[PDB]
Design a protein around this ligand. Structure first.
Ligand SMILES: N[C@H](Cc1ccccc1)C(=O)O
Ligand SMILES: N[C@H](Cc1ccccc1)C(=O)O
Ligand SMILES: N[C@H](Cc1ccccc1)C(=O)O
Ligand SMILES: N[C@H](Cc1ccccc1)C(=O)O
Ligand SMILES: [Cl-]
Ligand SMILES: [Cl-]
Ligand SMILES: [Cl-]
Ligand SMILES: [Cl-]
Ligand SMILES: [Cl-]
Ligand SMILES: [Cl-]
Ligand SMILES: [Cl-]
Ligand SMILES: [Cl-]
Ligand SMILES: [Cl-]
Ligand SMILES: [Cl-]
Ligand SMILES: [Mn+2]
Ligand SMILES: [Mn+2]
Ligand SMILES: [Mn+2]
Ligand SMILES: [Mn+2]
Lengths: 462, 458, 462, 458
């Protein structure tokens, strides 16, 4: 009568434990205080962690070392990073059509951005694990315990669903592994075929109210593709498209149980977080002496740190020295989210000070999380013009300083939602009640995200 | 303890004929099904109708083309893995081992056959088995694989539990993710795979017998490299997923309808790339055969010693009505003592129909006996001999010995007798770990690939 | 004291003769009257032919069957033919720098045209054998026997040099084979590298007086190339560029001694003319019952026929039926040279009548040979605007009829000559005396030819 | 009769140092040169300064990189063709045969070596030879190859004629055009080339001895194909042109200056890709060695039984002053009876210098004798044995046996004694067609490739 099915888990034999030396390092790191963690009992968390220690990984080390090399190129100014997907993934919407939509939107943006940048685009999805979020307050407008993502509790507004349930750590892995199996399948079959992808852009150009504005660039791209074909370059020549998985490393019970030690065939064994390919640390959990930063020191994965308007140049240097102690280009990404009214003033000093350290970080724009406001109709929202403008300001800072505008980080979807105001749709406050489906922040819908890619490409062409 | 899934309180409807044909198939009698309550099965089916598929249609169409080459005599099929996967052993080391053993056998067979080898694993779903008796030798309700019931000999664990339909998908999907990750990784690199054959040659008691062929293979690989062919030039290694389509509650919930980018909409079973129908579930007017008629996936049918040439024609005509080479595989499982006498007349009739099926040898399931120590077992020499007889039948008739279907593992278990290890009946109790039939261990499967390669060379 | 060296030839053992059946066919064909042939003695011609029967061929059959397949695509509307080079090759200018220049110009035009057409361009050079020309009158303005090309006599204005010398048949082969060895070498090494070729177009855009007009398309092409690179397509992926050799089959003594019989490994043996890959028959030698047309019936090579303003639709059908009796697309090319003032009127009926036959010919524009006039400064010349305009009219005829404008045939050079009037240079009648170096017709210089390619590409884009 | 070329009554000037170094090299004494008048040589040189080159610089830089791999022990060099090309036999069938034999030997050697084979033909220029006596056994002025004089034994034909400088370029250029055409054609297709080995195995008297290796090679090729590697995947077959740089009037007129797209301007001899300096022209302060110092081409030096370890070091230091691996090849030609004793100490000293040269065996030129029937000849067993001794020296020292340099033809001549054909002294008069030294025929060269492949396998 709860409309729910229960899946038993047996406490099955664990694989040989992690080596004692790394466990000691790891235990030292997680002794530090950890903001934003779930409040579930510890014996129960341990039981779920023991299950996760034994499951097949979501990613494998060799894919992560591959990503590291591709991101190294981004840091050196010869590549561009595209990172995008849902603000919050839900288990109920973790379906083939939704997954296919988001993959498709990301591929569409990537080809437009590749042409604009005239250099390779690394495609990183917010997918297969983006199931946890922080909150500012512990009581929401409905008087309930806050929703903190499907890894922690349920979205539905009732007390039973909002209690912190550690079994969701395993339900999270099941959904993540299944989502990733599908991403891998899609990217290695027709969906990622270049000539198929631009034909979607041709449907966008015909059915956009501002399609006449983007016709020139769309046509230009189409002729670049036919040029390749005409020069005797076929699909299988290009090779399969690669879409990496990422999420905010927020719930340490999950991330630590997904840790694995590498083969040692490559050379030296090391701890990888195999819940994803890359992870980032959020604005509310980046305490310099906190457990999240310390966790990121111990793992080999490429990492990111969100930098909001309170950031100082000095604190940014500390992040560079702690998270890139061996000076590996593209190991650390700094993700500026300042707001379009503040980025032109606040970012330059941070960039200058970090460049002076001699490290090579990736400068990445998040034009979303600095530009959120509430509408008069009641829906939390963002304006497309303000999103565009911060990317514009981001690029101007780098063009002025002679540094690399290394990528973008956006919240998008392949669904035709009504969540962000503006775009060629020119969506209104009234329109938001039509299809407002996000479980957290508002996303660019399929048309808007494409429109944004076209605009960021023109910024790459200047 | 438990994790919990929300049934969707809440997908555009099937074309009318497919709905009609699907209902008609599943209305027919079905052997070997679980006995759990319908309202619970329905709830599980509704969850599985919403999950991301294990495979996609374009992969199955691709498999269909590659299998067509096998049917035509221009490729060879290698199918292998656990007799029964367990949720307990669905781990990275176990999956990686089985993937590795298959890749190793494959390269040896490629070289011996002088033609491409299609690699199909029994994996990411092989969670159900049929039984002859519903009461086992301990007086318990029989184990029928982790989809239906638990391996442990306890009444409570043997109860049929429909929540295992969803746990089985969770494990299948997680396993397939890893298979895809590994196969795009180095693990599938030709040069890496050959270096495992060197380890085997050095640490086998019969290594000296397989050295000449191993050295010849190694030189074949270095020749490619010297002619200017690098890893990245090669097409990425492809390992397809298969299992027996046994539990119809599972297979029907994993059905999806294709797009119209390539022809008319069709039903694909996306729990796997290819499935087969077993000896006990193969009734000509039963639900399993009829389900196979409605799905677009390539299929196989197991054929034992009671098979007639006439029944075989009927299977081909029902399951390959449009004469699509490689859509149907006939899986011969006769026993080494009977295959030479029983297979030829079946092959002759089927060839005369004009259809192009893949003839595949299963040398395992016709050669089981019980040891004096108490473990059910197979002798390595009997396994080799059925494949040998299978090859002779096809050489004599001039037809294509199209492939093998074997139960193997990448661990050094002690389940099948013999091989260069000369495993005795006493040795079986050391590492007998299978949840059902005895598998060739890592050395024995490798030994078999070498021996079958020589059969391909003659 | 004649400033000349004599190279002995020994009458060395001939290879086994051609088979008797083909020789009988061939003898029947060459019994027909042959316009424009040299007047040298027959015993002497025989001696040189016997030498040529024994030499290594300029081309090989498998290359010609390859060309046939590529031209088949042109005829079916999925490819474009570029044919170009000197009006008349001279032995004295058959040098590495001159050869490299012409190859380079052709490659430059090809990449611009490939992008414009969005389909593959077959590159055929007028090279390695274009050493013979017809004449209208037998006495030139200087009162001497006419120059008829280096295969026949010398350009210098003196009686000794103008006598018809059959040893030039062998000197012609020596130069042809040597030129081709170099073309093969250049095309299989860096010169034909796509990314190298467009950088020359970047030097053209900067140093053309009309460079600002062609900047947009040049930039667009450059971004198409970087797109390929960014998608992970390297040089060796594309494969080596192919440049085929062609000339007017005019001197039958030469063409018939260069005939060879194919291996028979492909299937059926057949006569190929191995002096070139493809040859064409000129306006003054295309007598329907003449030896040139009959010769073209017997060889397996792809052929062309020049169609001037006197052409009728009926006579064009006869050419199609005689030269394409087995209906092989791209085996026959019809080369319209009408003049820009006449093409829009005269070509349409010819096209309609030939389409009605059911054959698939290649429609090729020669905008040069219909637009020649004499300047007030004394130099035979052509105006760039009139050349451009006939290609324009050619395209309009095909766009109107729904048929394929299959290619162009031009006389160009990689030298900065002053021979054709106009272009962005806007060369004048006065300017012609600067660098007028052609041994026959005026050629588009390096800048003009490129300018023409840019203009024909825009015609392909509409 | 004759064709006639216009000397150009009428090229931007060489950098001052290159001019200086070139003049200084050619001012030194030069052995074995033709004795024709200077004003006529100058006129011929002026014509050749204007012709399209036989090779281009980027091909030579490419050859230099591939030869570097040989020097490092990661590739093998095959060099072969006519002892002396003739203008009379410079025909399509003769060129195609020699190209074919080289491609055939190459694939066998690739498989035996398990590493890439650089293919260098003696072709498109091998028109000059040295002589010990200026009067031959008939009392005529000696034949010195078609560049200088005619083969026929007539005083008039033996006169040194400088017009042969231009006739030699004409033939060289025409031959190279065809080589390039053939190598981009099917003729260079791996699968085609192996089918010629099958013909050889069936129609050799010793075919049964080479069948196992032939079958193994065939299976190596089918393995590539089965792993999804097609012709078009492979890099196009490359055959480089070489000859002895003997006639300095020829080589100097064929010099061209490079561009600055890759470093400083340099002189390339574009009559070939690589050239070598012979035993009789190898004087340390002579014009040939000094000419070799000024050109960018990879070079070789022939080393006979009088060679010292010390003189060898001097050649390496003069010819590889910048320590560029594979820029220099040392070509051992000792005699099968002497190579085991005479080569080791030379190899030891040269290795100690720190330079990386290619050690190449010439098993031909140390093993000539005169038969009782009157034809100069070599025995197949002696040729094989020098290569065998050459391999032993390098195995014992742990150095790289880098290649072979042989005189072969794609026609079945009767010039060298022995082989599976067991050609006798009586048989020599059947088809003795060489214009100088006896060449291994089409069967014998192939037989040698097989035998050298086994030496590479041990
Ligand atoms: N949509 C998934 C169903 C699912 C079950 C098991 C694994 C993966 C997904 C959920 O509701 O949690
Ligand atoms: N061995 C698996 C662990 C697992 C849990 C959830 C999903 C997938 C796998 C099980 O006990 O079910
Ligand atoms: N430029 C050539 C020289 C040449 C000679 C021989 C062969 C090819 C070219 C000529 O004057 O005829
Ligand atoms: N065999 C050649 C024929 C030849 C002539 C001219 C150029 C090239 C080759 C000769 O007698 O010189
Ligand atoms: Cl907190
Ligand atoms: Cl890995
Ligand atoms: Cl709230
Ligand atoms: Cl039953
Ligand atoms: Cl699909
Ligand atoms: Cl006339
Ligand atoms: Cl050919
Ligand atoms: Cl005149
Ligand atoms: Cl001398
Ligand atoms: Cl070059
Ligand atoms: Mn968000
Ligand atoms: Mn079994
Ligand atoms: Mn002309
Ligand atoms: Mn010799």
């Amino acid at each position: 009568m709860n409309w729910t099915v229960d899946i038993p888990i047996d406490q099955l034999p664990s694989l040989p434990p992690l080596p004692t030396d790394l466990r000691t390092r790891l235990d030292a790191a997680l002794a530090k205080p950890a903001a934003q963690q779930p409040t579930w009992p510890a014996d129960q968390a341990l039981a779920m962690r023991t299950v996760l220690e034994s499951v097949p990984p979501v990613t494998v080390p060799s894919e992560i070392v591959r990503l590291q090399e591709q991101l190294a190129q981004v840091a050196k100014g010869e590549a561009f990073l595209l990172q995008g997907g849902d603000c919050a993934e839900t288990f109920m919407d973790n379906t083939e059509p939704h997954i296919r939509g988001n993959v498709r939107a990301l591929l569409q943006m990537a080809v437009v951005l590749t042409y604009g940048a005239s250099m390779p685009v690394v495609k990183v999805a917010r997918i297969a694990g983006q199931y946890a979020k922080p909150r500012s307050a512990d009581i929401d407008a409905l008087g309930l315990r806050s929703y903190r993502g499907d890894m922690i509790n349920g979205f539905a507004p009732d007390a039973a669903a909002r209690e912190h349930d550690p079994s969701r750590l395993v339900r999270a892995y099941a959904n993540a592994s299944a989502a990733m199996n599908l991403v891998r399948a899609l990217t290695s079959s027709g969906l990622a075929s270049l000539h198929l992808v631009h034909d979607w852009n041709r449907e966008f150009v015909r059915t956009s109210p501002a399609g006449a504005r983007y016709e020139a660039l769309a046509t230009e791209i189409d002729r670049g593709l036919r040029f390749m074909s005409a020069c005797g370059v076929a699909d299988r020549n290009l090779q399969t498209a690669e879409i990496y998985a990422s999420h905010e490393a927020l719930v340490l019970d999950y991330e630590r149980a997904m840790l694995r030690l590498s083969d040692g065939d490559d050379g030296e064994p090391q701890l990888f977080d195999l819940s994803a390919h890359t992870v980032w640390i959020g604005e509310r959990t980046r305490q310099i002496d906190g457990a999240h930063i310390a966790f990121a020191q111990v793992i080999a994965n490429p990492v990111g740190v969100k930098l909001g308007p309170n950031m100082t140049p000095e604190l940014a240097v500390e992040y560079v020295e702690r998270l890139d102690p061996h000076n590996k280009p593209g190991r650390l990404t700094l993700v500026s989210r300042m707001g379009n009214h503040k980025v032109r003033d606040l970012l330059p000093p941070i960039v200058e000070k970090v460049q002076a350290t001699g490290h090579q970080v990736i400068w990445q724009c998040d034009p979303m999380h600095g530009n959120t406001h509430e509408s008069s109709t009641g829906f939390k929202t963002r304006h497309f013009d303000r999103i565009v403008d911060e990317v514009q300001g981001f690029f101007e800072v780098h063009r002025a300083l002679g540094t690399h505008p290394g990528g973008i980080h956006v919240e998008i979807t392949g669904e035709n939602v009504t969540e962000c105001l503006g775009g060629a749709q020119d969506i209104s406050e009234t329109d938001l009640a039509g299809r407002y489906e996000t479980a957290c922040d508002p996303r660019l819908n399929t048309q808007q995200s494409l429109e944004l890619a076209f605009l960021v490409a023109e910024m790459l062409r200047d």
